[PDB]
Write a protein that binds this ligand. Structure first.
Ligand code: LIP
Ligand code: LIP
Ligand code: GD
Ligand code: GD
Lengths: 272, 272
């Protein structure tokens, strides 16, 4: 898989180049499932580039990509080598020129992530992680923080892409519950992949969200775990990649405390 | 004042060097008025340095600083030249190594800000602005966004430092109103001065908050205005540096629409 991975880092750098040239130019902003679910031409062409490049070298492999699943392809994860691609994680940031946009590639064999690559092109930061080998940013090794006390922790989360009132209501009240524990604070930079890479560096202690997709988190998940952190479902159980929920923490102590505090929001799975 | 200003830029870059070497070392964290109201040796160290060097060169000038006020100095603004200083805006970010911390200096004469310098040391970003002379980031000229439609805007705000349940419920309730207009999104980077600097560059369309202080916003306010933005009280009234409240928007249409939507929290003024 190291060949696949070496190839992946090369593709991520190239697609990052395209994303960061486009971010300063004029854009065609179109709508996906709602007025706040957006897509530009750059989302579409970068995903096209990546999928057809990988298919060339590795014609037997499977793909799950955002814009492809949007085009009618299905998100069904099987045992076959599958590349899980978000061409632009943080499309709303991109459209606004808010300076956090990531290219994300995860690679799963037997439904387990083997390596992940996250390229934050505006910052010039390349995060990579291979199962068993550690996590790196620009060739430097990452470690999660050591905080075990929730009342001294800094959390990252997002409000999400739903404006359904009851949903929005549970998101905000889950926030209030954690805020008033109290925790030191809560941050939102606008993309799941970068929020998670900030946990891996030890800049934040935990990230949680409900509503994300498998493509938003596949690459960054192995970066957290290889840096020493943990992935978990909001029930407190095992992380389920197709479930649309994630807690990504420095350790199980903080992970479990969050799970205990927050209420589950009902969501259709990626595999339904 | 250009000599004062050139001096200020030199001082901010210097102090930024202290902050950003300190951030990679262990801190003893201390509390002020609450368990989420944090201070370290560096906040105090840096403010002392800053105030000595200025009044070394400018004996007649007045000073307002966060840790000085915590040491019993009073935050009254006269017509005298006054340096308004936050050594570290983003102390909780600093403590955690969350990569957004700023040194902030504003300079007021006759109770109006003449110039402002904000140094985001981890990114190596120096934002400066002088009345009538424009806004710059590392030599590059800033311009706010053109967005006049609130339904297509991206906002920044912070949950703040109060854990009083009445206040917190108001903060989130105001959030919910705006989120559900709907706006494209809401981000939180953890420091007012950096939040406001993101508005000046055009990356975010507007920032608002209640509960901040004159030292959090004195430097970055003139950077937004010289980039073409507007400042305003959340009441709809004129911005008031001592009122603990601010909207910093790209334009009047957005600022007034926000004031309309949100309710005011009663706050103790800085000059009281
Ligand atoms: O659409 P996108 O920018 O690729 O992915 C985004 C995620 O990174 C973010 O965590 C989530 O809150 C947004 O709703 C959206 O899903
Ligand atoms: O205390 P500090 O780090 O100098 O300044 C911080 C501000 O930048 C931030 O906008 C606010 O939400 C925090 O409560 C705090 O006031
Ligand atoms: Gd995306
Ligand atoms: Gd401060």
């Amino acid at each position: 898989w190291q060949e696949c991975m070496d190839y992946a880092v090369t593709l991520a750098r190239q697609a990052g180049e395209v994303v960061c040239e486009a971010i300063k130019n004029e854009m065609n902003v179109m709508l996906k499932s709602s007025p706040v679910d957006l897509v530009t031409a750059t989302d579409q062409k970068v995903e096209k580039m990546l999928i057809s490049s990988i298919k060339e070298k590795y014609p037997s492999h499977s793909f799950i990509g955002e814009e492809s699943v949007a085009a009618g392809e299905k998100s069904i994860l099987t045992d076959n080598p599958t590349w899980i691609i978000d061409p632009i994680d943080g499309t709303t940031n991109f459209v606004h020129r808010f300076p956090f946009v990531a290219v994300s590639i995860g690679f799963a064999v037997n439904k387990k992530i083997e390596f992940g690559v996250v390229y934050s092109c505006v910052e010039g930061k390349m995060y990579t992680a291979r199962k068993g080998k550690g996590a790196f940013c620009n060739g430097q090794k990452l470690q999660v923080s050591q905080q075990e006390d929730i009342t001294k922790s800094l959390l990252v989360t997002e409000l999400g892409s739903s404006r359904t009132p009851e949903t929005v209501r549970m998101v905000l009240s889950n926030m209030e519950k954690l805020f008033c524990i109290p925790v030191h604070g809560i941050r939102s930079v606008g993309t799941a992949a970068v929020n998670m890479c900030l946990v891996a560096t030890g800049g934040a202690d935990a990230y949680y969200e409900m509503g994300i997709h498998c493509w938003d988190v596949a690459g960054a998940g192995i970066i957290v775990t290889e840096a020493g952190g943990v992935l978990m479902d909001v029930t407190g159980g095992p992380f389920d990649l197709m479930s649309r929920r994630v807690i990504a923490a420095n350790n199980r102590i903080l992970a479990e405390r969050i799970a205990k505090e927050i209420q589950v929001i009902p969501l259709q799975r990626d595999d339904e």
